[PDB]
Design a protein around this nucleic acid. Structure first.
Ligand SMILES: Nc1ccn([C@H]2C[C@H](O)[C@@H](COP(=O)(O)NP(=O)(O)OP(=O)(O)O)O2)c(=O)n1
Ligand SMILES: [Mg+2]
Ligand SMILES: [Mg+2]
Length: 427
DNA sequence: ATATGACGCT
DNA sequence: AGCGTCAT
């Protein structure tokens, strides 16, 4: 066993991100139950982000604003900007950039969503460990850090607990030895406190972090103490932590695979996987998955933090649910044009900022009926950032999908259009 | 009826 | 190349 204690990895995720972006801009919304919403026309718009004050009333994502007002009569709402007849997320992308640029200053980051990134702090920890000369680590360096699983053994409020675990941890801490993994996580954590102070100081956004030995544990830990707090999950904390951790809560196990592990194995919790041999697990779920479950239920995972702060694709989509589905060749050309146009603006920007060009265009459509996300995908060359050309070509490579013998109509009505630029390349 | 992005498998 | 899974 290489006790997967070779790296220090952190995941930083912003608290109710879209809400914070709106609240920084409109101070009236601060410290109040509020949500960000998309498309006012239908039931007040669907909710995409909720403040913690509003979560306390039960408001969630996937909820009509109308319905959320019932749980929470005083809920304030901000709408997503809308442009060319669709949601426009530029404000959130720009806020995201602010945050990525700051984290990038500390370390090598992997952009994992619009509001989170992974950081590999192995080197910064090592470096910081040479320049602190065996000087102890004070609790005052860790003003927002929880140590998962402490306190234990021999104040009933939350900050009281926080501190006692932190004190126990630190008093435990094995400081004259620099190869200690726990000490490294600690130093990593001091670093992420700094990171997190820089982010708030420079953008006014609060976030949470997890600090551990790998991406999966870091991500899990991030959630344990949201909002505005960070959590160190040490290797030794894993058996107790996983012993009642529902399987679905681990990254990549929230879907069918996780369900099949539960069903086939007849278990509920991560820790229960330890009782199987790697071979048994590979027989059930394949070589890479068995291997991966066998390691992961023991807290070990080697997926690296990828040095990638820029998306691999840029894309645009719109659903036409139910009656609104597109059923004329005019509707299809016109929305393709609407989408091509945003994509053109986002591409030109991208090229200026990041010295690269996309080279392939991916057209996706959904049809009325077909089960889920995409029904059909077709590719063509992306050679000019021209919305009219991208539109034209996108149509070209999907027109044959139209079963309508009549020239004007489109059948079946399309319930989704998606354009995506991909295959980027230095420029 | 609530816009996006990464990546594996064939 | 085109489809399927998993995620925010
Ligand atoms: N299904 C989803 C999930 C998130 N998002 C957007 C809005 C979120 O504010 C933002 C960040 O995602 P998120 O981390 O899952 N949630 P959020 O940051 O809002 O709240 P917490 O992380 O504090 O729980 O992505 C979305 O548009 N659709
Ligand atoms: Mg978040
Ligand atoms: Mg997130």
């Amino acid at each position: 066993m290489a006790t997967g204690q070779d790296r220090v990895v952190a995941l930083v995720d912003m608290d109710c991100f879209f809400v914070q972006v709106e609240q920084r801009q409109n101070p009236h919304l601060r410290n109040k139950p509020c949500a960000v919403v998309q498309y006012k026309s239908w039931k007040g718009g669907g909710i995409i982000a909720v403040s913690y004050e509003a979560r306390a009333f039960g408001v969630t994502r996937s909820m009509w604003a109308d319905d959320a007002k019932k749980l929470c009569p005083d809920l304030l709402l901000a709408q997503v900007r809308e442009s060319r007849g669709k949601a426009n997320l530029t404000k959130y992308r720009e806020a995201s950039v602010e945050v990525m640029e700051i984290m990038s200053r500390f370390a090598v980051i992997e952009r994992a969503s619009i509001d989170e990134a992974y950081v590999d702090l192995t080197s910064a920890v090592q470096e910081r460990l040479q320049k602190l000369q065996g000087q102890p680590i004070s609790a005052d360096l860790l003003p927002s850090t929880y140590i998962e699983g402490l306190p234990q053994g021999p104040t009933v409020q939350k900050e009281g607990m926080r501190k006692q675990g932190l004190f126990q941890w630190l008093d435990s801490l094995q400081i004259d030895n620099l190869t200690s993994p726990d000490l490294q996580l600690t130093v990593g954590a001091v670093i992420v406190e700094e990171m997190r102070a820089a982010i708030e100081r420079e953008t006014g956004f609060q976030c949470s972090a997890g600090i551990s030995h790998n991406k999966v544990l870091a991500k899990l830990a991030c959630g344990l103490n949201k909002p505005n707090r960070q959590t160190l999950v040490s290797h030794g904390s894993v058996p107790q932590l996983f012993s009642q951790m529902p399987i679905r809560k681990i990254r990549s196990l929230g879907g069918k695979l996780g369900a099949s592990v539960i069903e086939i194995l007849g278990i509920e919790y991560m820790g229960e996987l330890t009782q199987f041999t790697e071979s048994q697990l590979q027989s059930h779920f394949g070589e890479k998955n068995g291997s991966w479950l066998y390691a992961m239920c023991r807290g070990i995972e080697h997926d690296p933090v990828k040095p990638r702060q820029l998306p691999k694709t840029i894309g645009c989509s719109k659903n036409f649910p139910g009656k609104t589905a597109l059923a004329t060749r005019e509707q299809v050309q016109w929305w393709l044009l609407q989408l091509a146009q945003e994509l053109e603006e986002r591409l030109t920007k991208d090229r200026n900022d990041n010295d690269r060009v996309a080279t392939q265009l991916v057209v996706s459509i959904r049809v009325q009926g077909d089960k889920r996300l995409s029904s059909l995908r077709r590719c063509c060359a992306l050679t000019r950032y021209d919305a009219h050309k991208m539109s034209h070509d996108a149509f070209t490579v999907i027109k044959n999908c139209n079963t309508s013998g009549i020239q004007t109509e489109w059948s079946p009505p399309l319930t989704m259009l998606f354009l995506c630029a991909t295959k980027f390349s230095a420029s």
